[PDB]
Design a protein around this ligand. Structure first.
Ligand SMILES: [Fe+3]
Ligand SMILES: [Fe+3]
Ligand SMILES: [Fe+3]
Ligand SMILES: [Fe+3]
Ligand SMILES: [Fe+3]
Ligand SMILES: [Fe+3]
Ligand SMILES: [Fe+3]
Ligand SMILES: [Fe+3]
Ligand SMILES: [Fe+3]
Ligand SMILES: [Fe+3]
Ligand SMILES: [Fe+3]
Ligand SMILES: [Fe+3]
Lengths: 146, 146, 146, 146, 146, 146, 146, 146, 146, 146, 146, 146
């Protein structure tokens, strides 16, 4: 792995978390049903984390002398996360998030491989920190769906 | 003015502030020069306000039974703000923001006209609150450029 | 509009919010069902706002040299809000509140007309502030009922 | 004493404290004279305590499987406290409160007898807690009147 | 009653609250269903109180020159609370807790009898404080189950 | 109305609040009598608000590209508020403030007319915010004088 | 028991806690040895509690229309606690406090008897609250002495 | 001046502030009249300062290897402040305090002379700090008496 | 290593920390000697950490779709930590803890091996975090024993 | 030196700090250039200190039975500080402040001479406290100008 | 790698961070130029981190039974960082820090190799934590220099 | 005395406190024995004060246009404090500190003479502030050694 490989892995997540920031706002606004208050709030906490993550990842890429993706056009052309359709039920939103977080978990695992093979412990650790939280999110969200 | 006219004005700003949220991150990350610390921090405060604004505007549209724009594809197709090119100097970034805020100020003025003619005092007031802050931003930023 | 017209509009709301303070306590205490914790807490926040509102409205009437209604007998003879029957389901309570808030929203709209035609910007603004929050409440509560 | 006897004693206080909540607002708003600032603030603290008390007493009645009174019509038909006439001087207001608190103190004493004879230590203790504070209030208020 | 009788009553609760601390963790971890977030959090607050209670009860026994039970083997041989089976539904967990709290309420009542007949007002009061909270818990939890 | 008309109205208040800042210090220092503690503190809170107001008004004038008055010589030549004579009784000080606030209230009303006719909602709102507080002050202060 | 009997019991403690406030300062200042930091701090916390107690007890006597002892000459003529000799070792100070607290515990027990037989639940409870803490202090302090 | 001279001056104040701590409690408890709330609170703040002062002065004497007076018997035999008679009006209490503080101010002045002539800048400064506050107290209290 | 191997390692620690939570309470309650205050407090901080650890470890096992041990019977049958005998001196307690922490350190080292060989970076990191603190504890505790 | 000499020295500073309060607002509002944010904020902190100083100095003059200057007309006729011309560059503003602070430092030195020769340690110390801060300001501001 | 190898790597950093603590104070004190406020503050934050680091590294060496370097003579004989010459411009200071941090980054990388090859995950992680921050510092500081 | 004499006295303390900062870390790390927790913490508080002192003294020298010593080589060549030998017992460490603080107290006394004879009240006061605390430290530390 090279520093450039790590910059690329970091940028994919910058893109993903920007798309997720918007998608979480989508679900935060469009949730309905007796579990409105729970999800509305939950999704807000999630988007808050998404925002901290975008700045963290981007600033680590600057730390390694890289260029963080910084346009919506680029996030859309780079992210692997589908945007909200704003039509799904509360159930669909939670299942979609389990799916999205799950996919991101898989991306983080590979991303940590790349950073490790490039001898980049800090970037690996940053990615790990998100991985740890997303895995917590998936359990709780899957539990919710019973 | 109709409630739908107001929903439209509100959505243009939802789109604008999402694009600005990203653009402010762009400038926050790419700023260089002896005024790095000042701008880096300043732009961060600005993006923080942008984020609060997106949720406020969108939730007011829900309050009026409207659909807030909730996809990046839609923000790009709707916003009137150009995305960061990530190549400008510290000077260019500040001047661009004065220009962006200035244009948004003009949009808010019209937007407040529409809400007023629709008998919508709350939406008018929300828009005013941003207008008041942006005008403060423009003075300080223009002062900076001497 | 005259100052007296505004004092009257303000007093109707003083009466309404006193009746609502009690009604919200009613629902806060009598809620049952798997959404007990959500509503119990929610209604408590609502009654907290009701209490702040009674003092605000009454103190604005003092500010304009008026007499704020200050007896339960007068609130009952003046308010347009029906008291809780303490027998409704969680669903009924939320629907009733949407209805109550909705009616109050309509009263506020007229009340703001009166204050405006009397050249009373402060009272108009106070009434607006509640209007803005109630509209937020109605969206969330209606969302809850799916 | 039976649990029902205790529920009744608790409800009389729920009614009394609701009537007092309004009466304290009355005095808070109508106080005049060089001791305006003192009393205005003092009465506000008093109404704040009244509000906490209504919820506490009512929730203890729920705890014992009872129905807390939850309508203004019922508070008026049950409370032993006369509503404010909003015409009294600062002196009259304080003396009236000494009288009201004093009467409530006597009600609490009997109420604690009933709870004790029903083997209800928690309700007795709750009532005691108010008794302790009201006795403090009476001393200070009587001291004020010299 | 003797001081030793009171030490015994206190130790049964030390044992009970240790077993409950674990059982509450069980339910906190194994809860599933759309009410996951509510119960997960609720049970956490409950275990937090259980922990404060174990230290309080044990330190009162030290205060009376007694030996607080301090081994898991002893808690299991002394507590009257059945451990979680980790297989029950969200409904079962809440009903079980209502049952457990209810039984503990009955134990506290007797325990307060013993302390009173031993002339031990402080221990009686400590036990009362828990009794008061558990009764609040039972109402809310029973309300939840509709 | 023109932007210049609004800048002028804003500057008159900048001048007034500077003169009031000093006058409030005068009364804060020279108050005597059994109501020393009340007024001394009250006047301090008032001067604190006066200081926030000077900066707010001046910064809004900068926001509109105007020059805020910034010399004592200019405040004295522009303000309509008479300076403290430092010889009045506690009664005179409070009555004087009711008079001063009352006059400022009348100035704000006209000032809001001007901003409105210039299409300047933000400046109108800023002025309103003070108007709302001064009216509260006048009621309390007039109440004090019985 | 009569209210006067309770006033007397309360005053003995007002006297005792004033003498203890000074004695605790004595030990706080004169402690030496490797356990200086522990005791110095500990005694400070103890004197802090002593001060809160003096005001609480005295204000309860005012609540019952009594005269709280308020002179050093009277505290010395009434307290049953011997003043510090300022010559004892760290060991002696702790043992003395165990003895002093122990004696006060015995006084509180009787004092609670008197309040109970006078039908004074609040004063009994106040005294209990100190009793509960002193018993905690005695255990810890006796533990310290091994 | 010698270190012993300074220790003596410090001890007179330790004695004075202990006597004042009690006297301030006296006035705090026995104040009556429409200025009850003001004085009651004021005297409490004063006694709070008295308590901090006793520990500060005593710890400075320890710092200079001296023995701080630590018995009530010694404070009474050393202080120059007369104890409260608990019979004076609110007016008398305030005038007495002006007199007491005034006398202490005169003692501090001499005490600072002694510390200065002993080359003890720290003790001089400690004494000064109280002197500065007492002079503030005297102005406010004298102002109160008109 | 497999995910199941990691779940097993995590559960052994869930069991160990539950047993330690109780044992730390044992030492917290039974400590005596001039170092009572130090150890009593220290052990409390230790048990506080033990409690956070149980929830963290268990929630990570849920994250990996495993079943966390949740009964006292299972903790006793699984933990490798001996329960307190409540008879040891302060010295014995500290030495025992050094021994217990030391053994746990060795378990964590192996546990981190297993997580690493299973490609489980998050669980490895969680275990590391405890390892880091326990090693700090052992140094301080060994230092204490000189 | 006499008390009157000290009152005069104190009043000159009351006047100076009032003029400086306005001048600092002048520079706070009129600063421009890339160091806008730095100075704008810096000057605000400076004016905040100026405000605390005016009240402190004036209250010390009351403490010594003097009349603090309390009119703008008197500050202008007494202060030795020239008002802002609102036309200077950022550089000029900072240099002017170094000059103003420097002159005030020289005034404080003389002022402390006067207080010392009048045997007024408290006023001398108050003046010293400002002197200490202004000297810090001058270093930083001179450093800024390179 | 052996534990001793890790102790050595840790001690080199203890020495480096002590030398940096002083050097950062040097730059904090000697900075001049229009970027005085920025750097002065920035360097202070940096020295604050340096201080936390010295204690962390040293306490980890104690944790591994090692001797942390604890004399200035040893830091100077061991550190690889050159001390400040106190003569450099603001530019030189920042460039020097980029160079110093950069060198330390390279030392940390090797140091983490050693800890890893010794099977010391905790020490490796501690070193990583600094590495992560220093890399952030270098980007910002290099950005500043344009 | 001249300003240069004062700069020299200030620099000796800058050197001393830097050497003490390291020495306190030495004792903080190397303390052992049953009083580990006490001293470990105590020494940490002491080093914290040492750090604040270095910056204060150095910034006062900048205030007087002097050059603060800013290299370890210079501190070692200037300080009069011997560095820790890291071999002493807990007893030796405390005695050494009493000796070190005592010597510094003597240096401060002379240093205050110099500042006074140079007409430098601020520097004299700064030095006094440390003197006052060190004398407190010596009493407590000497008390500890019995
Ligand atoms: Fe950032
Ligand atoms: Fe939202
Ligand atoms: Fe109010
Ligand atoms: Fe409630
Ligand atoms: Fe405990
Ligand atoms: Fe400002
Ligand atoms: Fe009190
Ligand atoms: Fe002390
Ligand atoms: Fe949890
Ligand atoms: Fe003041
Ligand atoms: Fe440390
Ligand atoms: Fe500094």
């Amino acid at each position: 792995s090279t520093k450039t490989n790590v910059v690329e892995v970091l940028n994919k997540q910058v893109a993903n978390w920007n798309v997720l920031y918007v998608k979480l706002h989508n679900y935060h606004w469009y949730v309905t049903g007796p579990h409105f208050f729970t999800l509305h709030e939950k999704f807000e906490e999630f988007y808050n984390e998404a925002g901290t993550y975008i700045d963290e990842l981007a600033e680590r890429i600057l730390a390694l002398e890289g260029k963080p993706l910084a346009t919506m056009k680029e996030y859309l052309a780079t992210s692997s996360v589908n945007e909200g359709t704003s039509k799904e039920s509360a159930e669909e939103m939670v299942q979609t998030l389990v799916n999205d977080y799950s996919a991101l978990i898989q991306e983080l695992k590979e991303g940590m491989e790349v950073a490790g093979e490039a001898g980049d412990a800090t970037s690996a650790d940053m990615l790990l920190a998100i991985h740890t939280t997303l895995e917590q999110h998936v359990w709780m969200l899957s539990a919710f769906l019973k």
